[PDB]
Every structure is written in C-alpha cells, then in structure tokens.
Design a protein around this nucleic acid. Structure first.
Ligand SMILES: Nc1ncnc2c1ncn2[C@H]1C[C@H](O)[C@@H](COP(=O)(O)NP(=O)(O)OP(=O)(O)O)O1
Ligand SMILES: [Mg+2]
Ligand SMILES: [Mg+2]
Length: 430
DNA sequence: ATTATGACGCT
DNA sequence: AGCGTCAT
C-alpha cells in the first residue's frame, strides 16, 4: 500500500491547436474568421480534399478526408482555403512556420516534446515546484483558471443547465477541496500546472492570435486524452482520482497507441470494450496475449499510470517530401519518375538548407520510398544512400540510382508507382 | 482517388 | 538495413 506507485510523480500537459490549419488561414484572411471554413488541397478532383475544418463547419457534419464538393452538400456556405502548391505538390511551409511560432512560445515556459505540427507535450514538474515555492500558502483563486475543466466534477447536488455553469461549479468543488497546505499533494501540483498552462495558452493566443486546448495530468497519455475532452479553446485537468470513472465507459480505441490493430486485438481477445475493464487481468495475462512491453504498459495504463518521459526535442528528427499518384495518374515512364524525384528533391533541398542555417545541423542519409500500384502499404520499398551534398540534382539522381532496378520492363516503368517519398535523416551537428 | 509526412518498434 | 504500426 505504502509501496504501490500511483503514477503521480510528474505534471505533464499536452497543448494542441484548435482547427490549426484553418486558424492559420483565418489569421491571414479576416474574411474567413468565425465562419464555417475548411482547408483543402488539390481543387481539381472533387473540389479538393479537406485536411482541416473549423468548428462552425463541424456543426454541419463536415470532416477531414471529405471531398470539398461533398462538404458543400452538407454546408452550402462553407468557405475554403487552398494549400499552397509548388512544383506540382502541396507545400505546407505556411503551417510549419506557424507551428514554429507556437513551439517557441511554449519552450519559454518548460521543456517540450514536439509531437506533431500542432501539439507538444510539456513537462511542468519543475515549474510547478518553483511556483509552489513562490507563493507560500497562497490559496488558488478560480480567476486563475478561467478556461479550466475538472474532469469528473461537479458531482452531487440551476446554473448547471448551461456549460459554463457546469464548468464553474466543478472548479469550485475542486478548489474548495484543495488543501494549499502540503506542497506535495499531487492534486495541488496538477492545479498549479493548470495555472501555468492557462498562462501559456494566454501567451500563445496573445502572441500569435491562435487559440488552443490543453490537457493537464500526470503523464502523456492522460494529458493527451484530457486535451480532447473540452475542445475548443478550453483546458481540462485529469486527476489520478478521476481515472476509474473516466475509464469505466472509455472505449479502448480512444487511448493513444490503441487506435489500431493492438487495440482491436485487446477488444477481440479479452472480450471487453472499455479501458477500465483491463484492471481485472493480471500483468502476466496481459503480457501473454500482447507481449512483454505491451502487457506491462496496458497493466499500468488502465490504472492511469504511464512512465514515458517527455523528451527534450523541439526539432524534427527527419525532413521529408512525398507525393501520391492515385489511380490512372500512377507513374508509368522512366522520365516521369525522374522528373517527380527532381521536384521532391528541390523542395527537400530548400527545407534542408534552411534547417542547416536555423539549427546548426546537417542530414547525412537519404531514404527513398516508393509505393507500387496495387499495394495497400504506405511503402512498398525503402532504399537509402549517403546524403553528402544539399544538391537537388545529386539527390534526385542518387534516389533514382537506388530504386531504378525496381523497374520490371520498358523507357517504360512498371509496375507503375503510386507514391514517391524522399526523407532526409541521421542529422549531425554542423 | 483518404494526402503529406512524422516517430519509432521489430527483426 | 528494411519493414510494420500508429499517429496528426
Ligand atoms: N490525416 C491528416 N492528413 C493531413 N493533414 C492532417 C491530418 N490530420 C491533421 N492534419 C493537419 C491539419 C490540421 O489542422 C493539423 C492538426 O491536426 P489535429 O490536431 O488533429 N486537428 P485540428 O488541429 O485541425 O483540429 P482540432 O485539434 O481542434 O481538433 O494537421
Ligand atoms: Mg489540433
Ligand atoms: Mg493535433
């Protein structure tokens, strides 16, 4: 009892931007603000593919992966913004630069781990300790947490007919219970972490004009889950004590890393649907079905416990460019293949050169991946070679050299390629 | 014809 | 080294 770890050692948050690519386009074009809007790529086929959707547009049922022509059927007044196109492919530079704006603000507060173009984990354990020392015995006011939800509250016994009324009542219950006394209560630490995350979210909105949501908990999985509970423009605190009720009706697929085959297996092999049901199995039983690492992870995670560290990494480990060639457009000639490789290499060269100037590093390996027609896998084949010069002509020529014997017969290229992907990796200081 | 592209585990 | 999974 006295010796059972409860996974309450850290304070971790996950900050994720709300409808991020849309906000980027709305900041730039004020006519799009506060309107049902989506961002699309490649307008020629079915009006383009939607990759981001404003919350006003979601209310009509518009979603990612939907065709714009189809989205317009659900939402006639839907406004659209097109992703920039360069060299015949989508160019996501505008969103990467916007991402940098936000990541640089978050880094001021604590160590972060970039997790995607629009989210990062934050390890607030040290910052909370410092803040706790800064205010001795200072009780925490509700005004310090104007956009925070406490998951699981309010509980027990009219302002609650509306959502802000629920939020405030739950926050009051939580704050009324908190003992400022006792610098080591995990609940107190989370609360101070939440205050700091309000400050962080305020700074991002002030300095970039972008709104975001956040989750604060004791580990990355719970912080990520918490982030999505009250999006948009709100933050949610998930305490250790909230986990049994929260996990009791939480579908297994909603937990990070369980959204694929492993999660399906868990459900299928154990005959359960919710994360909390995992507690009735022993660690050995879970290890026997899903392996040593997965079994141990599951046994601790269904109890709200996870030890994956927030890595101190702001910069991407790899830099890559890819393009799909669906259906009839699959590449069928040598020349075609070489031209598209050159286009990808030119974009890559730009991004690498910038990376070298900004971050004092150079990539040393080039990985080329291709997908052949009829193959469902992301990558049909991967090959690599040395990246010794940031030269687009050398890179595209070397990439062709490494995959040219994949061609069964021809001038002609077969089987046709439905994807080309160039990735620069193995960075070293410069 | 659900795209562009990341991190990282397994062998 | 090369492939498979899970992810936004
Ligand atoms: N499958 C995909 N393919 C291409 N781009 C994608 C993508 N999923 C996301 N993006 C791009 C476009 C997105 O804007 C961005 C962030 O991904 P989220 O955080 O998953 N989604 P958002 O921020 O939009 O809304 P909110 O978080 O409020 O739910 O990455
Ligand atoms: Mg987001
Ligand atoms: Mg995200």
């Amino acid at each position: 009892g006295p010796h059972m770890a409860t996974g309450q050692d850290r304070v971790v948050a996950l900050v994720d931007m709300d409808c991020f690519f849309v906000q980027v386009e709305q900041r730039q074009n004020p006519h799009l603000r506060n309107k049902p809007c989506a961002v699309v790529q490649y307008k020629s086929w079915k009006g383009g593919g939607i990759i981001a959707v404003s919350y006003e547009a979601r209310a009509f049922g518009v979603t990612r992966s939907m065709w714009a022509d189809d989205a317009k059927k659900l939402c006639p007044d839907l406004l659209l913004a097109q992703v920039r196109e360069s060299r015949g492919k989508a160019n996501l530079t505008k969103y990467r630069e916007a991402s940098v704006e936000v990541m640089e603000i978050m880094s001021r507060f604590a160590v972060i781990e970039r997790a995607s173009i629009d989210e990062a984990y934050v390890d607030l354990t040290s910052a909370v300790q410092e803040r706790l020392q800064k205010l001795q015995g200072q009780p925490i006011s509700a005004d310090l947490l104007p956009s925070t939800y406490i998951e699981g509250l309010p509980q027990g016994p009219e302002e609650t007919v509306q959502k802000e009324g629920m939020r405030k009542q739950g926050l009051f219950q939580w704050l009324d219970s908190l003992q400022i006394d006792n610098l080591t209560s995990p609940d107190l630490q989370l609360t101070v972490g939440a205050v700091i995350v309000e400050e962080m979210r305020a700074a991002i909105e002030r300095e970039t004009g972008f709104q975001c949501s956040a989750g604060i908990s004791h580990n990355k999985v719970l912080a990520k889950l918490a982030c999505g509970l009250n999006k948009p423009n709100r933050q949610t605190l998930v305490s250790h004590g909230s986990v049994p009720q929260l996990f009791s009706q939480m579908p297994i697929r909603k937990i990070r890393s369980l959204g694929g085959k492993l999660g399906a297996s868990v459900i299928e092999i154990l005959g359960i649907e919710y994360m909390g049901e995992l507690t009735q199995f022993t660690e050995s039983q879970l290890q026997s079905h899903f392996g040593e690492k997965n079994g141990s992870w599951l046994y601790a995670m269904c109890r709200g416990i996870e030890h994956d560290p927030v890595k101190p990494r702001q910069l991407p480990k790899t830099i890559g460019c890819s393009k799909n060639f669906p259906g009839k457009t699959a590449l069928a000639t040598r020349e075609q293949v070489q031209w598209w490789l050159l286009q990808l290499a030119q974009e890559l060269e730009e991004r690498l050169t910038k990376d070298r100037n900004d971050n004092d590093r150079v990539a040393t390996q080039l990985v080329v991946s291709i997908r052949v027609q009829g193959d469902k896998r992301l990558s049909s084949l991967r090959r690599c070679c040395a990246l010794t010069r940031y030269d687009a002509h050398k890179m595209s020529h070397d990439a062709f050299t490494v995959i040219k014997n994949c061609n069964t017969s021809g001038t002609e290229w077969s089987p046709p390629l439905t994807m080309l992907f160039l990735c620069a990796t193995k960075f070293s200081a410069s």
